[PDB]
XYZ file of C-alpha atoms in Angstrom:
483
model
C 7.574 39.482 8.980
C 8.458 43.479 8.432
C 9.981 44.805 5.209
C 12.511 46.781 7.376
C 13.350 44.008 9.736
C 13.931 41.776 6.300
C 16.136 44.585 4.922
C 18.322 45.832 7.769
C 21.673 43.999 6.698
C 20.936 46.171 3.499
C 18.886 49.272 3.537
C 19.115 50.394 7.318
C 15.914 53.043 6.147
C 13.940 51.002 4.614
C 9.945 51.298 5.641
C 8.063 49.354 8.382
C 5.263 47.301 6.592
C 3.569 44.239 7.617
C 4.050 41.321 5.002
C 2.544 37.535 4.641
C 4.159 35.619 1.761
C 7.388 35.983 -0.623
C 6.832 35.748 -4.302
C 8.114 36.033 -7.682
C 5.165 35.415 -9.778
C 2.713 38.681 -10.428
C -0.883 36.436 -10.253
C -0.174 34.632 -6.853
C 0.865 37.737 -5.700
C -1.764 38.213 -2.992
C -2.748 41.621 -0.112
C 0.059 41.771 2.303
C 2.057 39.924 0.065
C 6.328 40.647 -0.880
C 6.420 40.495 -5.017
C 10.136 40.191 -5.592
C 10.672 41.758 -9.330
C 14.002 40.084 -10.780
C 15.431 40.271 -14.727
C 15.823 36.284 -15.276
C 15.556 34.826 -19.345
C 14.308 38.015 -21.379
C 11.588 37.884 -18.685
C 11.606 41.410 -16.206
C 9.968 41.501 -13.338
C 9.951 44.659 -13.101
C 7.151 45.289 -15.842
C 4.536 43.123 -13.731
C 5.105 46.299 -10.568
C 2.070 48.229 -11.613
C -0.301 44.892 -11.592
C 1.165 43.908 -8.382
C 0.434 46.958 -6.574
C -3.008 46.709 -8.687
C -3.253 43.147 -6.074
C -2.594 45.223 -2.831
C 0.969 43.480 -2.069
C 2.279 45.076 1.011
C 5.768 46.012 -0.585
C 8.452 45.531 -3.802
C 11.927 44.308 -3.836
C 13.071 45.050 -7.995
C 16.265 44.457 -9.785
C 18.076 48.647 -9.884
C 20.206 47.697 -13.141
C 19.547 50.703 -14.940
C 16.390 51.922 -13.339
C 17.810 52.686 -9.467
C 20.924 53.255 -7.256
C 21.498 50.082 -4.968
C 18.874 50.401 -1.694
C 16.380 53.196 -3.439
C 13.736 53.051 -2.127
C 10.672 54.684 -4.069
C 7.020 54.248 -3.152
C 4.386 53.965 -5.731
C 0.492 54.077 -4.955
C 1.792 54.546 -1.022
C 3.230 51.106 -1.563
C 7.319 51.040 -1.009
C 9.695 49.416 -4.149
C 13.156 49.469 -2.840
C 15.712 48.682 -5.128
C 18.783 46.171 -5.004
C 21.348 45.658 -7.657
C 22.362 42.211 -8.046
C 19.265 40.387 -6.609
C 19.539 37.009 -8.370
C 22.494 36.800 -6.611
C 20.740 37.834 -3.277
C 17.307 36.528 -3.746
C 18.862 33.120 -1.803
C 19.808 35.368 1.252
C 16.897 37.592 1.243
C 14.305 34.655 1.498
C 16.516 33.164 3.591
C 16.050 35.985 5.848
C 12.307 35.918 5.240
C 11.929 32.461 6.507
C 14.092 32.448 9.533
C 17.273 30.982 8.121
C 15.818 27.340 7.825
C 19.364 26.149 7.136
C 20.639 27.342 10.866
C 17.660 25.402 12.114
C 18.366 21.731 11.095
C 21.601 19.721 9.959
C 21.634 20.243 5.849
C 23.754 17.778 3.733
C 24.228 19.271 -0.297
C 24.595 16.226 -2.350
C 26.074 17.222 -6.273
C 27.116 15.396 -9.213
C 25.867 13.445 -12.193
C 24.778 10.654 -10.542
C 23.815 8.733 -7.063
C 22.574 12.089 -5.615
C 18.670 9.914 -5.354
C 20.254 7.468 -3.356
C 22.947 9.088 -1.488
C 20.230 11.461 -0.243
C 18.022 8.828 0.458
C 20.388 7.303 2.387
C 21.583 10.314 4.097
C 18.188 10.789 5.434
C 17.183 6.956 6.480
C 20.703 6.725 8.219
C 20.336 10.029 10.289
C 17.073 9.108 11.263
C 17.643 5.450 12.212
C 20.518 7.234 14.295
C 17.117 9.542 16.065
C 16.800 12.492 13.744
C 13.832 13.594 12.271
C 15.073 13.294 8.511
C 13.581 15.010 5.075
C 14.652 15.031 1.333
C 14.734 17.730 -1.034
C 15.700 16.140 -4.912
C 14.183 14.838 -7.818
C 11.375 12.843 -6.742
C 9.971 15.429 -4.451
C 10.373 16.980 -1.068
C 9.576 15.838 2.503
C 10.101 14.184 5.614
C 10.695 10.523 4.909
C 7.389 8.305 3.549
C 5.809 11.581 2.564
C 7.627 12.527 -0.317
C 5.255 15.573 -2.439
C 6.219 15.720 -6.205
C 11.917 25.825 -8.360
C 13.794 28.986 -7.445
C 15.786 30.590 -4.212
C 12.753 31.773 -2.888
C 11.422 28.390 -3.010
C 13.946 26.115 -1.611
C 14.188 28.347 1.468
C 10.161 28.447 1.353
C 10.015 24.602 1.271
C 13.165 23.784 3.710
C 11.051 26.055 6.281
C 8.032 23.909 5.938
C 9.963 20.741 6.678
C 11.410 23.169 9.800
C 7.873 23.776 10.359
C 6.728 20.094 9.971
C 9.792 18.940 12.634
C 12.701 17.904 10.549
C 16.112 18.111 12.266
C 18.030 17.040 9.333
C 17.970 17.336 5.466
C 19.382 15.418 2.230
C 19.141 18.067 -0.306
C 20.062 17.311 -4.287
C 21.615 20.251 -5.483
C 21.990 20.464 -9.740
C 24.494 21.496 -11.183
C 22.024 23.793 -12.739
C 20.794 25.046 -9.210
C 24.520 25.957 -8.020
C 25.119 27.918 -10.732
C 21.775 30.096 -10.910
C 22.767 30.957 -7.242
C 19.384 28.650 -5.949
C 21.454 27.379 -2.706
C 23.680 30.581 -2.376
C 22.555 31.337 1.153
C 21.930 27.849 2.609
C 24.016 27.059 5.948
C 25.449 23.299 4.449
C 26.391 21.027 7.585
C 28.175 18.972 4.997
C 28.719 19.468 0.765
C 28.789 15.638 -0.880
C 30.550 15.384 -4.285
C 29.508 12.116 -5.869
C 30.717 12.354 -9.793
C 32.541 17.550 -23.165
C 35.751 18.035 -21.440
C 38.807 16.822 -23.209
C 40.586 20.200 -24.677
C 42.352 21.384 -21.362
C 41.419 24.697 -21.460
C 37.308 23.801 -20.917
C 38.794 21.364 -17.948
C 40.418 24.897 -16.507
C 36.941 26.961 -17.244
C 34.988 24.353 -15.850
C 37.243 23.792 -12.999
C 37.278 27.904 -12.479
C 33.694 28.187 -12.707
C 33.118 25.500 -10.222
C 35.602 26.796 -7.618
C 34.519 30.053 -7.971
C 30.695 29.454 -6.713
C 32.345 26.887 -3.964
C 34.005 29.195 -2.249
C 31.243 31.618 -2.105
C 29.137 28.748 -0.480
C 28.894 27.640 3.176
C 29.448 24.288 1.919
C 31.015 22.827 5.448
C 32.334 19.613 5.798
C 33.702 18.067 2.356
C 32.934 14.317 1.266
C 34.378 13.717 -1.481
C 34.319 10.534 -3.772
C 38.012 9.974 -4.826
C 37.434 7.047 -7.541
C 36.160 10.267 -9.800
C 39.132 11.919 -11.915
C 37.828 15.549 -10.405
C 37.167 14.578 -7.117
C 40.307 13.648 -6.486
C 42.288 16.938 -8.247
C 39.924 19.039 -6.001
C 41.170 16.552 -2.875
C 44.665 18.080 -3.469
C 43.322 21.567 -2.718
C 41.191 20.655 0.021
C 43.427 19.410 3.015
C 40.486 19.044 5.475
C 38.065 16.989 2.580
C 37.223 13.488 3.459
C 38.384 11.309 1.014
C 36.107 7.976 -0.058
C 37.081 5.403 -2.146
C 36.507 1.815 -3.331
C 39.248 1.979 -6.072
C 41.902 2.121 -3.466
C 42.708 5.830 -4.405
C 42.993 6.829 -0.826
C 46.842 8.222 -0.278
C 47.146 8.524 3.279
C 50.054 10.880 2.307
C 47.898 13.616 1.957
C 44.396 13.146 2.655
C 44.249 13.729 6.561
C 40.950 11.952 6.735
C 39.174 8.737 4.740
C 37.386 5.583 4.458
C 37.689 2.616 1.695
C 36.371 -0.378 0.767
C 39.069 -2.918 1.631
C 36.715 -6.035 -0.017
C 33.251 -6.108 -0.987
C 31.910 -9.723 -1.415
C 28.529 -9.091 -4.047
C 26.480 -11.693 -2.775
C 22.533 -12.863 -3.688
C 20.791 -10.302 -1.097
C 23.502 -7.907 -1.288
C 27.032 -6.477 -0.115
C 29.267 -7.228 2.482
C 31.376 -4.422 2.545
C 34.698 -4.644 4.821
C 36.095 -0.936 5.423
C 38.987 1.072 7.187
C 38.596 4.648 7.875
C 40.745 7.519 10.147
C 37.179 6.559 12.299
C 38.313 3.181 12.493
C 37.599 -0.118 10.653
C 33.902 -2.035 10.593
C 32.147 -4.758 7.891
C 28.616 -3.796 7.035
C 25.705 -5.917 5.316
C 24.250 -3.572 2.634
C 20.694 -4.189 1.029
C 21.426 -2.562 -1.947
C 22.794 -4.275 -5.298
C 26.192 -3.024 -7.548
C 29.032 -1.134 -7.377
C 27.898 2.226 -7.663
C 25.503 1.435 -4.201
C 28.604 0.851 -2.440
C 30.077 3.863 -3.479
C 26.886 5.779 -3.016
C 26.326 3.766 0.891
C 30.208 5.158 1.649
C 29.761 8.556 0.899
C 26.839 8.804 3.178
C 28.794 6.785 6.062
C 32.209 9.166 5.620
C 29.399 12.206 5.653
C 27.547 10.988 9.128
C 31.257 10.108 10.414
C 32.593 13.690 9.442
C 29.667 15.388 11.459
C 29.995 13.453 14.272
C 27.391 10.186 14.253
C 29.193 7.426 16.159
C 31.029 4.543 14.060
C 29.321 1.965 16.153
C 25.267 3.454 16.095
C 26.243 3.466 11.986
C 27.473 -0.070 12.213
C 24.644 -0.923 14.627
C 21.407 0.409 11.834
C 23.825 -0.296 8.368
C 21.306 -3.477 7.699
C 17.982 -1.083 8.059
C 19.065 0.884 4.787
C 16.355 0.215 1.928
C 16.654 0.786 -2.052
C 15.071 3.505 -3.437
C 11.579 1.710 -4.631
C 12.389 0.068 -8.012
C 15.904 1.428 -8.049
C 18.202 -2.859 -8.113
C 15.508 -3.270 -5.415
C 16.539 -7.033 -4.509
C 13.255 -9.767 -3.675
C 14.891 -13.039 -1.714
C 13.064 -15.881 -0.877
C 14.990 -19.090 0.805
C 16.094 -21.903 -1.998
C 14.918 -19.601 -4.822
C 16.398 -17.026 -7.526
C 17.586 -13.182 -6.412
C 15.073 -11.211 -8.597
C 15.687 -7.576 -8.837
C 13.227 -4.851 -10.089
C 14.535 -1.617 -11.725
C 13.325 0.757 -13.835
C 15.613 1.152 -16.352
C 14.106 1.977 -19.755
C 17.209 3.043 -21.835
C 19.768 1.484 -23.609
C 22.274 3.130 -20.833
C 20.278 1.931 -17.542
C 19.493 -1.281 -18.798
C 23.695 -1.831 -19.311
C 24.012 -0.559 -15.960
C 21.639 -2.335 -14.480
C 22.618 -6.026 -16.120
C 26.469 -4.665 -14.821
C 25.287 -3.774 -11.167
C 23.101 -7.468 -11.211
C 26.298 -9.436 -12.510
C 28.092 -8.662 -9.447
C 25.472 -10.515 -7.429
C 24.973 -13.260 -9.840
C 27.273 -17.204 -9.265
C 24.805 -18.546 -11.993
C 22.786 -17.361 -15.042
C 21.718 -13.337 -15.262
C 17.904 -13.153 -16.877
C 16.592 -9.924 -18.366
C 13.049 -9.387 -18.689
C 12.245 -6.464 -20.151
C 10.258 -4.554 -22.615
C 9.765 -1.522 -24.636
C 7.321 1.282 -24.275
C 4.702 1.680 -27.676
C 4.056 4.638 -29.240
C 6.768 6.502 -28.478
C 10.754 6.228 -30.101
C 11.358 3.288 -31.291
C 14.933 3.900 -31.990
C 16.178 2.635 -28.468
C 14.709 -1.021 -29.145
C 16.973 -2.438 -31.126
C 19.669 -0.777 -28.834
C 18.181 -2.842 -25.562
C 17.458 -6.067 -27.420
C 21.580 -6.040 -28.323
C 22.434 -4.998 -24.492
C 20.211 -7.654 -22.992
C 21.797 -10.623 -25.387
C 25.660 -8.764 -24.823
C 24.798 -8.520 -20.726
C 22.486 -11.483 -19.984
C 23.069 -14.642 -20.576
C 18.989 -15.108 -21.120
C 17.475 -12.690 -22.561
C 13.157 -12.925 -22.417
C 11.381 -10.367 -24.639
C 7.979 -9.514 -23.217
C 5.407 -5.992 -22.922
C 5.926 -2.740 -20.944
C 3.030 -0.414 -22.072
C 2.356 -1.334 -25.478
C -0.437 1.520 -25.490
C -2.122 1.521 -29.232
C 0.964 -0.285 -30.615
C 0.639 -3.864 -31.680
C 2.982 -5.300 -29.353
C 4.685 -8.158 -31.469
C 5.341 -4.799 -33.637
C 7.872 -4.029 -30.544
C 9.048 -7.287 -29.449
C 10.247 -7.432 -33.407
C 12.095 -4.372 -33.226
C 13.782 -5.455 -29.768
C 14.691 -8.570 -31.663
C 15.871 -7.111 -34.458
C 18.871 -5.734 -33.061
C 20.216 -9.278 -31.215
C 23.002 -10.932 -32.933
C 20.797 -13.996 -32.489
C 17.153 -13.679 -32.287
C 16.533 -17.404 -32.219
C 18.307 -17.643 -28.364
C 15.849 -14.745 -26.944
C 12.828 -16.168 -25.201
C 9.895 -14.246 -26.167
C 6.245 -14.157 -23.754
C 3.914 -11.938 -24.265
C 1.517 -10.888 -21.161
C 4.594 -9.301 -19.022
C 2.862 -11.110 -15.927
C 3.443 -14.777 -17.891
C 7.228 -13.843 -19.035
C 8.394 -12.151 -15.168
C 6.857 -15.781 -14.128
C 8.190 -17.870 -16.841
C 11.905 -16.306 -15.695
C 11.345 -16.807 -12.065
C 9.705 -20.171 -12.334
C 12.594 -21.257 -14.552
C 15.899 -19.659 -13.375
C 18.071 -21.716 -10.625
C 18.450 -21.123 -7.007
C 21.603 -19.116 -7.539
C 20.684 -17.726 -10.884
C 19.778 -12.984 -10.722
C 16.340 -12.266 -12.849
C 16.659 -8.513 -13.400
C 12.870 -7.065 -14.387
C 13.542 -4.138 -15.875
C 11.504 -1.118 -17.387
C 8.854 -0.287 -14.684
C 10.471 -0.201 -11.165
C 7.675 1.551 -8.476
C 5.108 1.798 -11.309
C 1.918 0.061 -10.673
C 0.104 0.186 -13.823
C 0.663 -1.336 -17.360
C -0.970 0.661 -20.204
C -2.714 -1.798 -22.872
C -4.871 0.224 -25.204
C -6.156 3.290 -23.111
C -6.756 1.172 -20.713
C -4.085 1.709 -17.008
C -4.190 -2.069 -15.598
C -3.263 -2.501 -12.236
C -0.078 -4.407 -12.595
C 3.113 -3.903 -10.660
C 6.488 -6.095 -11.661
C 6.884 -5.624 -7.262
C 3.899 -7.470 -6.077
C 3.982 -10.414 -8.702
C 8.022 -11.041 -8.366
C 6.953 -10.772 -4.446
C 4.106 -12.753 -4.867
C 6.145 -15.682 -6.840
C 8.379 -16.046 -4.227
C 6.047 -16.485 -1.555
C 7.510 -13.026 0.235
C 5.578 -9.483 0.463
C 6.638 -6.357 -2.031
């Protein structure tokens, strides 16, 4: 890596220096090293130069507002600063450029909304690689290729996406915030495909918002548009984007306009999942999902109309559909022949836990059980909040402990029951172990038992003390299957 190869498409004099890493932070910065300078939230860069140089870094890139004309370059202690105006919104291209354009060197999908980027990701990357990639993440829960997930600025996307280059990915299911897009953190990425999942109401904020939005868009290489069309946005920004695939299971397809689609004709929510019948402009197919609710359906679509859009064959999709796994703990459905669907999820708020009772419904011809808990020592304003969604969205409602901590847990279980309507028709069992049993043990063959609050975790905190205890292994272990 050479500071004048790097800088060619923008300072055709710039120095020939050797250089080892990229960095924006002054104490990594290492010998031979790049220290990018940059003017970010009242922090500057540009104060930690002298330091730097003090580390022997091989060169400076620095922010020129007010200091330098655009492409100055200065040297300081024999060590070259060249100056670029703008560089937030470059930073993106220049690592980029550092890290031999990672994006050109594997199929990246963008996923962005609110919600169902996890799992649309997730399935992005199971799908691709069931179809022979060699398939990665980059979101929430960590980076990787799949299995070997490891728990962030432009420099360090295009740092990390080069590793998974480096480790042999040939495809990529990136989350990109809302928060990322806008601080110009994906500005330079190559996007195979851009995946639109899902304080607004005066219309001109809806206009700003809108303008905002459109603007960063079309300064992206966002490729192939999926777009979900059951959102109120999605489908005003469908209008305006002829060549956007449309997905819906809302029946808000018009085949007027939209040139190309796929919807959800039926979906029959049954105990171990979804049958989903579909027509698309790729042709028409049923597919068994794994995964539990609506929102998984809309979430499994979008990454089917994605793999159709860049060219994975209908039938090979069709053909690896019944291989696609939850997201650990996320409605992640345990079946065992003549006994109750249990699902485990970990929501832990008053909203997940309504979605979550919602999603299991679907799935549920007999009773819907909620076992759940509340976390001690910490706010106790949500409890009374779940015990009234579990009585509204269950039809049995059994009260129990989810990391009590220091907090006498009856304490808890009082202030769950102190927001139900009627405390007397909650079922209360304390030891979470005896009350995920006691619902299991007791609900009918085509009765749902959601177990909500701890998903993937593995460990209940009593005291100080982190018992190994996973809701997983003992619903798995109850029903005679393996977690």
């Amino acid at each position: 890596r050479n500071l004048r190869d790097l800088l060619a498409p923008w300072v055709p004099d710039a120095p020939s220096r050797a250089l080892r890493e990229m960095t924006l932070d002054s104490r990594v910065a290492a010998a031979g090293d790049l220290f990018v300078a940059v003017v970010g939230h009242q922090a500057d860069g540009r104060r930690y130069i002298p330091q730097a140089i003090a580390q022997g870094v091989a060169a400076i890139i620095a922010e020129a507002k007010d200091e330098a004309t655009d492409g100055e370059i200065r040297e300081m202690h024999g060590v070259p600063v060249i100056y670029l105006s703008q560089l937030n919104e470059r930073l993106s291209a220049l690592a980029g450029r550092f890290y031999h354009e990672p994006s050109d060197n594997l199929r990246l999908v963008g996923v962005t909304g609110t919600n169902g980027k996890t799992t649309t990701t997730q399935l992005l990357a199971q799908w691709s690689q069931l179809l022979g990639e060699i398939s990665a993440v980059m979101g929430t829960v960590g980076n990787g290729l799949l299995g070997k997930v490891i728990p962030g600025s432009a420099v360090d996307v295009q740092h990390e996406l080069a590793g998974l280059v480096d480790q042999g990915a040939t495809f990529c299911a990136m989350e990109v915030s809302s928060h990322g897009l806008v601080q110009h953190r994906v500005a330079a990425l190559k996007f195979a495909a851009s995946v639109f999942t899902n304080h607004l109401d005066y219309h001109g904020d809806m206009e700003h918002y809108e303008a905002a939005k459109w603007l960063l868009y079309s300064e992206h290489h966002c490729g192939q548009a999926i777009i979900n069309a059951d959102d109120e946005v999605g489908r005003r920004w469908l209008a305006k984007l002829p060549d956007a695939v449309a997905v819906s299971m809302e029946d808000h397809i018009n085949p007027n306009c939209h040139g190309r689609w796929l919807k959800a004709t039926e979906v029959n929510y049954h105990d171990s999942g979804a049958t989903i019948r579909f027509s698309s402009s790729w042709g028409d197919g049923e597919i068994e999902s794994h995964l539990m609710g609506a929102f998984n359906v809309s979430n499994l679509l979008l990454a089917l109309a994605t793999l159709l859009a860049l060219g994975y064959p209908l039938a090979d999709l069709l053909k690896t559909a019944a291989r696609l796994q939850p997201v650990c703990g996320r409605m992640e459905v345990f079946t065992a022949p003549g006994k109750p669907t249990v699902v485990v999820d970990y929501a832990h708020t008053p909203d997940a836990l309504e979605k979550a009772l919602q999603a299991a419904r679907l799935h549920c011809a007999g009773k819907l059980w909620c076992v759940f808990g509340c976390g001690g020592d910490r706010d106790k304003g949500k409890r009374p909040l779940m015990g009234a969604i579990a009585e509204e969205f269950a039809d049995v409602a059994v009260v129990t402990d989810d990391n009590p901590r220091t907090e006498e847990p009856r304490a808890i279980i009082n202030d769950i029951l102190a927001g139900m309507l009627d405390a007397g028709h909650a079922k209360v069992m304390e030891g979470r172990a005896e009350a995920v049993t006691c619902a299991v043990m007791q609900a009918k063959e085509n009765d749902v038992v959601l177990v909500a609050g701890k998903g993937h975790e593995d460990y209940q905190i009593v005291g100080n003390q982190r018992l190994d205890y996973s809701d997983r292994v003992t619903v798995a272990r109850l029903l005679g299957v393996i977690a």
